[PDB]
Ligand binder design. Structure first.
Ligand code: HEC
Length: 100
């Protein structure tokens, strides 16, 4: 279950906040976020528990952060409730590996 064309319609839930193409806006640019540090865009103003995490966004840490953002980063400035199916986050993770 890694379909990148289905991850474009799931990324329509993200793309009012997050762009990919340099702009930022409400959330940062996600252009290769799979394998980037937590708090990893030099320019965007991040929250305290996002900066105190560090490390990396793996295709596994993103799979439970994209369904409960406040369970993995407790007190994030990301105003997002969660994705429901494991196919929704796995298809989006397959999209923004290639589409960046
Ligand atoms: C606007 C209401 C948002 C929606 C909808 C989504 N996200 Fe977002 N994202 C937003 C903000 C304000 C932030 C920054 C949080 C902070 O600490 O200041 C974020 C952050 C993410 C991140 C972390 C990126 C990093 O540089 O470490 C990820 C990985 C992220 N958001 C992913 C993401 C996806 C894929 C969404 C759609 C399913 C999504 N966000 C929605 C704001 C908003």
């Amino acid at each position: 279950m890694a379909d990148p064309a289905a991850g474009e319609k799931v990324f329509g839930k993200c793309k009012a906040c997050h762009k990919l193409d340099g702009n930022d806006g409400v959330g940062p640019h996600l252009n290769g976020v799979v394998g980037r540090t937590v708090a990893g865009v030099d320019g965007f103003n991040y929250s305290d528990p996002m900066k105190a995490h560090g490390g990396d966004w793996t295709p596994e840490a993103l799979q439970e952060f994209l369904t409960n953002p406040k369970a993995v980063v407790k007190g994030t400035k990301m105003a997002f409730a969660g994705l429901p199916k494991i196919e929704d986050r796995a298809n989006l993770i397959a999209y923004l590996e290639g589409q960046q």
